[PDB]
Amino acid sequence: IEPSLKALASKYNCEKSVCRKCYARLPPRATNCRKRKCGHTNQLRPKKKLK
Amino acid sequence: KEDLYQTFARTVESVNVIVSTYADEVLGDVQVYPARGTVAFGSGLHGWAFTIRQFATRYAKKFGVDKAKMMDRLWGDSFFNPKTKKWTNKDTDAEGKPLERAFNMFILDPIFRLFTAIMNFKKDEIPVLLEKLEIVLKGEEKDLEGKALLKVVMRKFLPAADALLEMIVLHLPSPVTAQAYRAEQLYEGPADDANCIAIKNCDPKADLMLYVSKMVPTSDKGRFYAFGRVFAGTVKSGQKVRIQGPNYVPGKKDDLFIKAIQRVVLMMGRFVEPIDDCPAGNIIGLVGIDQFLLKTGTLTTSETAHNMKVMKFSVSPVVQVAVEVKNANDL
Amino acid sequence: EKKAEYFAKLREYLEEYKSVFVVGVDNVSSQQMHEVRKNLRGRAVVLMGKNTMVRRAVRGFISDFPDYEKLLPFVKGNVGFIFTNDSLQDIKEVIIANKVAAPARAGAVAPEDIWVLAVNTGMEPGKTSFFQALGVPTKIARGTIEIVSDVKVVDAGKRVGASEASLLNLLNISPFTYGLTVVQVYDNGQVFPAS
Numbered sequence: 382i383e384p385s386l387k388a389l390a391s392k393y394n395c396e397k398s399v400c401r402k403c404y405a406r407l408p409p410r411a412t413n414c415r416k417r418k419c420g421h422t423n424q425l426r427p428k429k430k431l432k
Numbered sequence: 433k434e435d436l437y438q439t440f441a442r443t444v445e446s447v448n449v450i451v452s453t454y455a456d457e458v459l460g461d462v463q464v465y466p467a468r469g470t471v472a473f474g475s476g477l478h479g480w481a482f483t484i485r486q487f488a489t490r491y492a493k494k495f496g497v498d499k500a501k502m503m504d505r506l507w508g509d510s511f512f513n514p515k516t517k518k519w520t521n522k523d524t525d526a527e528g529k530p531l532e533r534a535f536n537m538f539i540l541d542p543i544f545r546l547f548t549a550i551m552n553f554k555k556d557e558i559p560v561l562l563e564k565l566e567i568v569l570k571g572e573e574k575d576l577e578g579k580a581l582l583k584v585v586m587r588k589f590l591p592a593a594d595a596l597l598e599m600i601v602l603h604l605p606s607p608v609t610a611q612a613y614r615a616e617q618l619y620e621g622p623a624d625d626a627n628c629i630a631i632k633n634c635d636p637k638a639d640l641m642l643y644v645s646k647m648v649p650t651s652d653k654g655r656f657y658a659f660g661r662v663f664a665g666t667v668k669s670g671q672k673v674r675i676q677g678p679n680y681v682p683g684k685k686d687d688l689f690i691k692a693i694q695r696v697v698l699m700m701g702r703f704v705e706p707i708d709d710c711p712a713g714n715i716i717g718l719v720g721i722d723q724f725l726l727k728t729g730t731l732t733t734s735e736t737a738h739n740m741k742v743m744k745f746s747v748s749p750v751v752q753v754a755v756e757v758k759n760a761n762d763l
Numbered sequence: 764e765k766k767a768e769y770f771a772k773l774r775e776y777l778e779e780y781k782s783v784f785v786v787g788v789d790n791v792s793s794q795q796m797h798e799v800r801k802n803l804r805g806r807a808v809v810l811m812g813k814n815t816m817v818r819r820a821v822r823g824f825i826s827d828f829p830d831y832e833k834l835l836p837f838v839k840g841n842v843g844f845i846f847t848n849d850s851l852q853d854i855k856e857v858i859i860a861n862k863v864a865a866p867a868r869a870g871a872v873a874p875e876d877i878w879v880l881a882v883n884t885g886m887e888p889g890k891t892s893f894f895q896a897l898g899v900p901t902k903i904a905r906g907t908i909e910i911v912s913d914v915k916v917v918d919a920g921k922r923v924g925a926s927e928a929s930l931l932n933l934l935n936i937s938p939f940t941y942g943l944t945v946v947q948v949y950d951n952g953q954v955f956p957a958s
């Protein structure tokens with residue numbers, strides 16, 4: 382892969398939060414979810430890393 | 433081509449690491465490398481393969497020296513070509529223009545230019561390229577196209593045989609040489625013994641003989657042959673040979689079965705019988721040791737001859753499974 | 764409170780010691796500045812600064828003393844004050860001669876082209892596989908790990924990879940070594956460029 386690019390594509394995929402309620406893939410520094418179907422909730426987690 | 437050549441280097445080195453990791457020797461010739469022609473590159477399913485020596489035979493005739501030896505610069509240089517016949521160790525020219533590794537240059541001319549031309553399906557360009565590589569197509573093989581054409585066409589240019597056969601003979605140790613540096617770990621007794629000298633010589637006159645360890649099944653079974661390589665002397669059908677088990681001590685009596693070897697077979701895929709006598713440094717599918725063995729049969733014709741090392745095949749038992757029967761009368 | 768105590772400690776210099784001798788001490792990375800604090804302890808003293816250009820402008824009033832007006836414009840970059848009356852040339856020679864050195868650069872911009880020479884590293888075989896993953900052609904020339912040719916790993920302007928940095932730390936120095944570099948020298952007052 383060359384780690385530069387893994388680091389590139391993991392930025393765009395894995396380095397990302399997730400809404401606990403609407404499971405939606407969120408941005409990492411996000412406080413609240415953008416989706417309004419979970420009530421713009423603050424309940425987030427990190428998207429789990431491979432291995 | 434650059435990315436391909438690297439892919440060989442990236443694997444060949446990682447092997448050489450794993451070669452240099454293990455273990456006692458420290459021979460000098462343990463490591464393996466492309467420049468040598470160790471090492472051969474190819475494809476089984478297709479059935480084409482080369483060695484770096486084989487392409488040095490073709491490049492030397494086409495503007496190059498020296499042929500018979502020396503030319504291990506394929507895999508280093510690089511060579512530019514339109515300016516002059518000369519090649520340099522520098523990656524760039526004096527102008528400030530990049531170059532190849534010369535391995536990329538030689539592999540381009542046939543292979544990369546074949547495959548792209550074959551994928552382009554330019555049915556006039558392929559005959560022209562076929563002329564450059566120098567023959568052959570015969571009969572209905574001219575009519576083929578696609579992946580099947582590429583496979584047959586490759587088989588003729590660099591038949592994997594040629595590369596393997598050369599490699600096998602060239603950079604590999606004989607039964608004389610192999611036994612020489614390996615007898616100390618195989619043979620558990622002293623290095624100064626009269627057996628070990630015949631193991632070093634690879635002798636046919638001296639004491640008999642060998643091991644087994646594994647055992648191939650027959651067609652009609654029931655029974656199953658003893659795949660053993662003879663370590664000293666020449667066996668020999670319908671002849672008495674001591675059958676020393678896994679843990680037979682020379683002085684002790686346990687695990688010994690003085691018995692006649694029924695017959696001897698030169699093992700060749702599915703068969704075949706021919707001859708009674710078969711010397712050391714040679715691989716044999718014996719039969720008649722089967723009832724009086726498990727697994728690991730050091731066979732001798734003298735009482736002083738020691739058992740070989742048990743092995744150290746390792747890799748566990750490991751996992752247990754219970755085995756019941758159904759009906760119980762078939763137990 | 765912690766302000767006014769620091770306001771007081773800064774009033775002790777320039778009024779003993781006369782030459783203040785200032786330097787950044789932006790990137791270090793140290794560690795060895797404590798050893799500079801140890802080595803200087805016998806003679807000199809160090810005192811670092813936040814928005815203390817405001818402090819020196821406030822002390823620049825007084826009425827009887829105007830020579831702190833020379834100190835008010837020069838602090839550019841993360842910079843700290845290392846006062847001592849001993850001289851100024853000797854302090855320059857001691858501070859330049861010390862320097863941090865130290866490794867390295869991982870996940871940041873390279874200033875120059877990182878060129879790695881050939882010849883043995885002085886190792887046993889293991890991370891030669893790791894080397895060739897990041898484009899460095901190695902061959903084990905009997906036991907020891909050797910590099911086969913001189914190649915640019917990363918060029919100037921480009922960011923250095925995390926895997927690339929680790930092999931440069933171990934075997935092939937970058938080198939991304941640096942230290943503090945004298946900004947200004949004083950004595951009255953007095954403005955001096957320090958070169």
Ligand SMILES: [Zn+2]
Binds near residue numbers: 400401404414
């Ligand atoms: Zn949500």
